[PDB]
Amino acid sequence: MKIGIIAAMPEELAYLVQHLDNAQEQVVLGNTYHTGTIVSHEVVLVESGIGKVMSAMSVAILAVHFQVDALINTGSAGAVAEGIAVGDVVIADKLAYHDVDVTAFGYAYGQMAQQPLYFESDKTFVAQIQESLQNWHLGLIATGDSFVAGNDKIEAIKSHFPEVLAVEMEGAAIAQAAHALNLPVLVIRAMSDNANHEANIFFDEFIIEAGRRSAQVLLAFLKAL
């Protein structure tokens, strides 16, 4: 499988670019796509930009232009669940939006129209990475076009998804796009903050570590795949 690897920010893609063999760059519509191999696997790496729209466009271009067979999404997120420490890794076995409301038509809160409420990382990828797995957790990552920085927002999100482990701005968008384009995806994150009132401060301090930790898990997964 040719694997597309997406990260929202440069800090989250840097470590992987450093491990890219026979690296080449291809500029497509103003963004750079890195091609080459990682431990034998044909990959395309891309820093998508932040949020639902930028994520969705990278998936579409990876699918249509680069003809990838699978996707891995890596980066940092905010820790919200019991037992999840800053620096921990979360493998998303489910993904959902925490900021979607089409309930007027009967959909569940969080469920986008003409979509399932929950998307999932590919089950075989999840089984394999668990085996290769750093303190880590398996569970729900909730996505929204918002940077969560307050207990009031955390509690709002938990009132809809009590089992949420972490929050961030792209996961469910990448999974929605991947599912629409018929591609398996694996979503991995490392915690840079607690999504609380200080979230922006700790995100700034720990983004590089979190980006690297998530990337290290991705590399361990590719070594075993």
Ligand X SMILES: Nc1nc2c(N)ncnc2[nH]1
Residue 16 one-letter amino acid: L
Nearest distance, CB of residue 72 and ligand X, angstroms: 17
- Residue 145 is a catalytic residue: no
Q: Taken in order 216, 36, 179, 183, is the CA torsion positive or negative?
A: negative
The binding site for its own copies (CB under 8 A) comprises 28-31, 49-57, 59-61, 63-65, 97, 99-102, 104-105, 112-115, 145-147, 149, 173, 176-177, 180-182, 199-200
- Residue 69 is a catalytic residue: no
**Contact partner, 76, from its own copies, ligand X, none, Cβ < 5-8 Å per class:** ligand X
Please give the structure tokens belonging to residue 147.
Answer: 């940077």
Nearest distance, CB of residue 194 and ligand X, angstroms: 8
Listing DSSP states for 26-67 in one string gives EEETTEEEEEEEETTEEEEEEE--SSHHHHHHHHHHHHHTS-
Contact in structure between 207 and 11 (CB atoms under 8 Å): yes
Those residues with Cβ within 8 angstroms of residue 152's Cβ, 6 or more apart along the chain or in another chain? none
Those residues with Cβ within 8 angstroms of residue 30's Cβ, 6 or more apart along the chain or in another chain? none
C-beta of 28 vs 108, nearer to ligand X: 108
C-beta of 115 vs 216, nearer to its own copies: 115
C-beta of 19 vs 94, nearer to ligand X: 94
Residue 51 one-letter amino acid: G
CB atoms within 10 A of CB 52: 20
**Contact partner, 223, from ligand X, its own copies, none, Cβ < 5-8 Å per class:** none
C-beta of 183 vs 217, nearer to its own copies: 183
Nearest distance, CB of residue 91 and its own copies, angstroms: 22
**Contact partner, 28, from its own copies, ligand X, none, Cβ < 5-8 Å per class:** its own copies
The binding site for ligand X (CB under 6 A) comprises 76-78, 108, 117-118, 147-149, 167-169, 192-193, 195, 199, 203
Separation of alpha carbons 58 and 119, rounded Å: 18
Nearest distance, CB of residue 156 and ligand X, angstroms: 13
Nearest distance, CB of residue 108 and ligand X, angstroms: 4
**Contact partner, 52, from ligand X, its own copies, none, Cβ < 5-8 Å per class:** its own copies
Read off the DSSP letter of residue 186.
E
Name the active-site residue from 42, 163, 193, 198: 193
Separation of alpha carbons 38 and 43, rounded Å: 7
- Which are the catalytic amino acids? 12, 193
